[PDB]
């Protein structure tokens, strides 16, 4: 199965506005193989990654992840995003971290313009435990049992500057895929769309 | 301790005139603070010495124009004339080419090592000036962001003590 697991696929697509404010939190990512928020309308069908489709068959997994971020700017937009990772559980409240107090944790910087349209990024495996459960079957929230090794946040590192005559805001896709993955304990779980 | 930290940021506008100081910053006094986990190391130590390394970043849209100047001056500018700041270690932010600079200084100071609870005077003042004013088109964003980074090097410590509390 390494094949499906090793190939980046779409995950979530967020807008980024010129009106955005410095130090704001644009979007928050629970970090699992199991997250896809994207969806389509007609025909009626719902996005699911490659990866998300495999691990949703398994009870457990561990390994690196690869977030490849791809931005579609002009040449003439300019700005910097930021990636700040925050280990923990999935339910820890990160909403109260400033821009500063985020950067303390491991982070990466990125520039919008360039001949470089993609940032490979690799979250090293950080856990108390050798694995993570797939919780979503078991409904209510049981203490200590965790899926996402932590949230990932995208701040707005600078405002978004641009001449007057071009599009005012830049979308960015979020790819997803893994490497050195290992999993076991099969099962059948239809994973319904994580929304928000 | 060796890692980077976001420190201070300010936006840069047109209305700033020549040598209107956009940024008067202090390296040390800002690091020591509640907001970081590097705070931990110092707050339990009386004496520390170290080297500094700085990053500075902006993102002028190439239709904008202007330039900025980053000088690392120990003590203060005092009455040292503006003109000569390039004497100090420095780089030149230029809308045209470089969007980034990196400055590295080792330790310079008049005593053995810095002391946090009772700093004599700030070691490294970080000054930034308007080197060539920002002139803009029409409809272009008339502002642009500016950010700063830092990290210690060869950080050494001495003198554990609770008295910080």
């Amino acid at each position, epitope marked *: 199965f390494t094949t499906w697991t090793s190939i980046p696929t779409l995950a979530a697509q967020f807008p980024f506005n010129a*009106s955005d*404010s*410095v130090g*704001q*939190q644009i979007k928050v990512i629970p970090v699992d193989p199991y997250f896809f928020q994207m969806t389509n309308t007609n025909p009626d069908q719902k996005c699911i990654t490659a990866l998300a489709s495999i691990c949703q068959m398994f009870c457990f997994w561990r390994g690196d992840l690869v977030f490849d971020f791809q931005v579609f700017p002009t040449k003439y937009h300019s700005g910097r995003l930021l990636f700040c990772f925050v280990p923990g559980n999935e339910l820890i409240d990160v909403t*109260g971290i*400033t*821009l500063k107090q985020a950067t303390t944790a491991p982070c990466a910087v990125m520039d919008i313009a360039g001949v470089q349209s993609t940032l490979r990024f690799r979250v090293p495996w950080i856990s108390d435990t050798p694995y993570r459960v797939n919780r979503y079957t078991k409904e209510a929230h049981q203490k200590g049992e965790y899926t996402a090794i932590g949230k990932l946040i995208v701040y707005c590192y600078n405002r978004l500057t641009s001449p007057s005559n071009v599009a005012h805001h830049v979308r960015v896709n979020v790819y997803l895929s893994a490497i050195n993955l290992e999993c076991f304990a099969p099962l059948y779980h239809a994973m319904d769309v994580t929304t*928000q | 301790g060796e890692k980077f930290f976001l420190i201070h940021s300010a936006r840069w506008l047109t209305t700033h005139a020549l040598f209107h100081e956009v940024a008067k910053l202090d390296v040390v006094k800002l690091l020591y603070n509640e907001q970081f986990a590097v705070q931990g190391l110092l707050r339990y130590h009386t004496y520390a010495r170290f080297g500094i390394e700085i990053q500075v970043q902006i993102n002028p849209t190439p239709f904008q124009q202007g330039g900025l100047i980053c000088a690392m001056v120990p003590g203060d500018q005092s009455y040292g004339s503006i003109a000569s700041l390039t004497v100090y270690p420095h780089g030149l932010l230029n809308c045209n080419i470089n969007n980034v600079v990196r400055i590295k200084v080792p330790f310079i100071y008049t005593r053995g090592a810095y002391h946090f609870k009772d700093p004599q005077y700030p070691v490294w003042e970080l000054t930034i000036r308007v080197w060539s004013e920002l002139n803009i088109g029409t409809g272009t964003s008339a*502002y642009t962001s500016l950010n700063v980074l830092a990290r210690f090097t060869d950080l050494e410590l001495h003198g554990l003590t609770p008295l910080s509390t």
Partner: antibody
Amino acid sequence: EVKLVESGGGSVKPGGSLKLSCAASGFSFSTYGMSWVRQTPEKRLEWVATISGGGGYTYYPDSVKGRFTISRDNARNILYLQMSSLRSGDTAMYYCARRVTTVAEYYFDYWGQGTTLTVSS
Amino acid sequence: DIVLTQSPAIMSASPGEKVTMTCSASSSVSYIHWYQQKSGTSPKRWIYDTSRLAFGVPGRFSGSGSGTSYSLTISSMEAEDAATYYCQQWSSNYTFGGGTNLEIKR
């Protein structure tokens, strides 16, 4: 476009209770802490509450401390401000405001129209 | 129990002149945010952090000050600015300024 809609409220006699609701739209709600802020008729303002991203933590100023309740269901992107044992000094305009983040501090962005609580009998 | 003051309560200014208003503190405060309220309208994003700007604002506004002292400054008065301007601190116990009425002169 951000849309904040305050609901409920009116004249209430001292000792009565009330709960208010802010409707949110146009942004992922769970990702932003929320808050209520009071406006006295004097065009003076005061900060009555905040709740964090999830259920998380809740913050109160001293004056109303223990007398008020704040709560969230992100499923509907709607708030609840639960008050009880109100007295006359509470009459004011109340707003809901999404709390966001800057470099070192917290800052309010969008404010709804707000409803009017009147404590008197 | 940490409070702000705004020196002018009410100030009138004509179009084409410089304007100054000052929020002062009962202690030292790192940053101060400003809000703007127009009649029958909820106050809005105005000037956050210290001298940084909101998006929608025109670029003729400025601010400065440090420690206990901070000041909001308007380069050249224009008619569309009439409002009340509130200040704020996030230091400890969240607190607002008493407001400063800006008024057109004629």
